[PDB]
Design a protein around this nucleic acid. Structure first.
Length: 62
DNA sequence: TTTTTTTTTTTTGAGCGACTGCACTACAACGTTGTAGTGCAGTCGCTCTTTTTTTTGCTGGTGGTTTT
């Protein structure tokens, strides 16, 4: 799409394909049936009754 | 294009340095012999650490799992 004319080696395309195969995004699906195990972002202000916070040691969070 | 069998483990330390025994000549004590010093070879102890250091995009943004 940029109309590149010069030669492109193998390692650049190999690293670009390796970067696009490990781009699996963190799932934010919520199921109302079972208890939801998830990270902080998906529900920021949703008002649940019981709220548990794991992994609150130094270095990891924030 | 088809198809057969099968239950037995092995090996691994070597260089450095001392202990002890026998041979071998030099030299003084009593021509010959006993004591002393060294060379070479078989046998044997011993001994060979300690450790840790990191950036990676939570959903960076037309994004988003699941039913007929």
């Amino acid at each position: 799409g940029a109309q590149y004319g010069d030669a492109v080696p193998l390692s650049l395309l190999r690293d670009e394909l390796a970067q696009r195969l490990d781009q699996e995004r963190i799932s934010q699906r919520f199921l109302a049936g079972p208890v939801n195990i998830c990270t902080l972002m998906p529900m920021r202000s949703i008002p649940f009754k019981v709220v548990c916070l794991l992994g609150m040691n130094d270095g990891v969070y924030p």
